[PDB]
Every structure is written in structure tokens, then in C-alpha cells.
């Protein structure tokens, strides 16, 4: 047996952050020896565990969130942080116990002119509870004037695109974040 981590980490195209495709891992053995000091793993924030002793902690379930965000938005993928990525877009629990993994993906997502297939939830007047998403879009956000239609200037369209460019920073580059969450999954 083996896990499908390389079906999760070494995948072709990831989710966006508004529609983070949660992938559940179970009935498996979880080898983390190829996963801690592999070369493109810039971020390996683990919270409830230690990654050296991740090979001998049996869990009954493993979730694997996965999306694509900016470099300087990995600061919100952490318990108890506020932005519009943890608040409005993807909330991580205060009782988090998994790991937050990320790596630069300027070659695979950002292109020379601009790649706009990645979207985030800028506007929402209710904070997200931990571990759920809203995928549906509608222009009616509660600014004022409840009239509905394809317009703006008081109520704006929620989803907006990242502007990804290669000569635009490394804190503004697509970081393919994979968030793990935690007795049939041993090491």
C-alpha cells in the first residue's frame, strides 16, 4: 500500500483558493520521509505534530486541501490569522493539527502576459467557519441598494482574479499550497 501524495503534490492543475478541492486520504500507509526535506517544500508549517515523528503517528483520517495562492498570502493559512484568505476565503481551525505545505510554481501557473484562471473571494459579509467553502457566485453583496442585476458601484462582483506575472516578485508568485489535516493511516 501507499498514499496518493504524488497524485496530490505532483498534480497537473490545482484548485483555486475559492474552490479548494479537498482530497481525503485513508486506508493507506503514509511515508513522510520523502516529504519533509524534498527540495521544493519552502513551507512546512506543522502544528499539532512534529514532522520527524510523523512516520509513527497513526491517524484515522487524512484530509488534503490544495489550492494556489500568492506568496504573501501564506501568512493567512495558519490558525487564528485574519486577512481575506483566512477570513473570507479559506478558514483554518484553531484546533488545527495537520501541516501547511507550499512551494513556488511560477512556471506552472503564471505565464508571460498574464494567467487569470485563478480566483479568490474578495467580498463576503460573513466570515467563513473552519473547513468549508462557498463556490457559488452572485453579484449581490450587502453594500447597500438591494436592487439586483449585472452592475456595480455599490454591490460588487465577489470573485476576482490574481494578476500573475513572472517579473513581478517572488512574494507575488503562485504558491501551490497543500494543507494536510488529521487509526488506518500509519507510517
Amino acid at each position, epitope marked *: 500500500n501507499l498514499c496518493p501524495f504524488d497524485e496530490v503534490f505532483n498534480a497537473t492543475r490545482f484548485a483555486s483558493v475559492y474552490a479548494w478541492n479537498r482530497k481525503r486520504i485513508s486506508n493507506c500507509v503514509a511515508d513522510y520521509s520523502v516529504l519533509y526535506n524534498l527540495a521544493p517544500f519552502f513551507t512546512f508549517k506543522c502544528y499539532g505534530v512534529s514532522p520527524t515523528k510523523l512516520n509513527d503517528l497513526c491517524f484515522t483520517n487524512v484530509y488534503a486541501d490544495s489550492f494556489v495562492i500568492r506568496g504573501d498570502e501564506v501568512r493567512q493559512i495558519a490558525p487564528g490569522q485574519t486577512g481575506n484568505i483566512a477570513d473570507y476565503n479559506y478558514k483554518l481551525p484553531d484546533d488545527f493539527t495537520g501541516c501547511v505545505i507550499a512551494w513556488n510554481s511560477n512556471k506552472l501557473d503564471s505565464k508571460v502576459s498574464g494567467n487569470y484562471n485563478y480566483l479568490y473571494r474578495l467580498f463576503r459579509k460573513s466570515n467563513l467557519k473552519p473547513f468549508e467553502r462557498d463556490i457559488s457566485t452572485e453579484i449581490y453583496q450587502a453594500g447597500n441598494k438591494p436592487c439586483n442585476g449585472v452592475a456595480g458601484f455599490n454591490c460588487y462582483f465577489p470573485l476576482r482574479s490574481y494578476s500573475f506575472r513572472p517579473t513581478y516578485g517572488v*512574494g507575488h508568485q503562485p504558491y501551490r499550497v497543500v494543507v494536510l489535516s488529521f487509526a488506518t493511516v500509519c507510517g
Partner: antibody, heavy 127, light 105 residues
Framework: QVQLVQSGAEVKKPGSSVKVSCKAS????????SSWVRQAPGQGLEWMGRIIPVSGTVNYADNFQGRVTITADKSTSTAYMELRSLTSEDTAVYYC???????????????????????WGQGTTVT | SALTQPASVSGSPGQSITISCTGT?????????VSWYQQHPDKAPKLLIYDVNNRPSGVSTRFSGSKSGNTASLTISRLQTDDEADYSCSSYTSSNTWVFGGGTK
């Protein structure tokens, strides 16, 4: 609290190569990361690079890409600095400091160093 | 690179001064992460502010910073007689770098 101890000065007139070692063995967690700055005589600081010794992930300022190679070993958790192709204008002071990770978690975060630099070395006045 | 900042300061005790650090809208203004350092003559610097306004523990009351959308600013009130040093800035700089802008002395 972390007790950075740095190397000695050098009188390397140009064309030489300089290594400066930043020995720190105090509150060495997995979140420890030692940045590197220049200070020229008479003007202000210039941040050079950054190392996370538990991973070896290296930042640079683009004025020091290919000039500096910040080497660090995981077990001793201390950092070196190989400035190469020197100039007489490179006579400066080269502190090492400690970037503060903002969070309680495991090792290897490339991004959390945005608090500041609290503790510093003692300066190697490399000429 | 090289956030401009004036190196001019009046050493008259009993008044209040203000030093404004400017910068582009990815260095300071793109972030709320401007920090400040003071430096001894020919020693290492030490930390005063970290985020915009804050302070670590061993920091006096008058050491306060502020932003203005694009031009960050520290101020000093009740200028103590022998406290003049080399004030230096920093910021998260959109590429994980810091950027120290000059000094003031």
C-alpha cells in the same frame, strides 16, 4: 537570549574571498533563521540574505545574487557567508542577526520572517 | 531598494520630532510591516518597532511608529538628552527581502 557569536575581522584587499561564521547556540528552535546585513562606513544598512538552518532555504537581495553563498549546517544550526569577487568599496561591517518567526509550529517556513531582527552578532569589519 | 529617508535631526532636548520614511507601493504601503532600528556608533543596532506601531518588551513609551498609506513615519516625544542614535528602517519587501533605508544622525 540566542547568543550570536561571530567571527573575526579580515584585511582582505580586493580579489580575495571572505567567509564569516555566525555561531549561535542559545534558544535554537526549528523556527530559527539568521539573516545577514552589510553596513558600509558612513551610510546605512543593506540586508544581504537569509538562511533557515533546519532546511537550508536561502533568500537574497538582488544586489547580492551570485556574490554571496550563505552556507549553514543543520546539526550545529549556524550560518556562514561567502562573499566573492570583492572590491575596495566592499570594506564594510557584516552583521548577522536573528529573524523572528511569527508563530508556534514545526520547522521549515520560508515566509514567517516579517517581524524584524531582535538580536544581532558583533560585527566583522571586513576590509 | 534604498527607501529614501532624511538624515537630519536636531539634538535639542525638551521637544518632539518626527521622521518620515517614504517608499514605493510594494515596499512600504504594499505592506503594514515597516519596522525601525536604532544603532550605536560602531556597534550593532537594536529593535524598536515591528509591525507599524508596536514595540518589544525592552522599549520605552515614546518609541512609536505610524504609516500614512505610502510614507511610514516614526515620532519621538519628550526627547531625552542623550538618546540620539542612527535610526534605520525596514519593511517586508514583496519578495521576502527586507530593505533598510539609509539612516538618521
Amino acid at each position: 537570549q540566542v547568543q550570536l557569536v561571530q567571527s573575526g575581522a579580515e584585511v582582505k584587499k580586493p580579489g580575495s574571498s571572505v567567509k564569516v561564521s555566525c555561531k549561535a547556540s542559545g534558544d535554537i528552535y526549528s523556527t530559527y533563521a539568521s539573516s545577514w546585513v552589510r553596513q558600509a562606513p558612513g551610510q546605512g544598512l543593506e540586508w544581504m540574505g537569509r538562511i533557515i538552518p533546519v532546511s537550508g532555504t536561502v533568500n537574497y537581495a538582488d544586489n547580492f545574487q551570485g556574490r554571496v553563498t550563505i552556507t549553514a549546517d543543520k546539526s550545529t544550526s549556524t550560518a556562514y557567508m561567502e562573499l566573492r569577487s570583492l572590491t575596495s568599496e566592499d570594506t564594510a561591517v557584516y552583521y548577522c542577526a536573528r529573524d523572528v518567526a511569527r508563530g508556534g509550529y514545526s520547522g521549515t517556513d520560508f515566509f514567517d520572517y516579517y517581524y524584524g531582527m531582535d538580536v544581532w552578532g558583533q560585527g566583522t569589519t571586513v576590509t | 531598494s534604498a527607501l529614501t529617508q532624511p538624515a537630519s535631526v536636531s539634538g535639542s532636548p525638551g521637544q518632539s520630532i518626527t521622521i518620515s520614511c517614504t517608499g514605493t507601493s510594494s515596499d512600504v504601503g504594499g505592506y503594514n510591516y515597516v519596522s525601525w532600528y536604532q544603532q550605536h556608533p560602531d556597534k550593532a543596532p537594536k529593535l524598536l518597532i515591528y509591525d507599524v506601531n508596536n514595540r518589544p518588551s525592552g522599549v520605552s513609551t515614546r518609541f512609536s511608529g505610524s504609516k500614512s498609506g505610502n510614507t511610514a513615519s516614526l515620532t519621538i516625544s519628550r526627547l531625552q538628552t542623550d538618546d540620539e542614535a542612527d535610526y534605520s528602517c525596514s519593511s517586508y519587501t514583496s519578495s521576502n527581502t527586507w530593505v533598510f533605508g539609509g539612516g538618521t544622525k
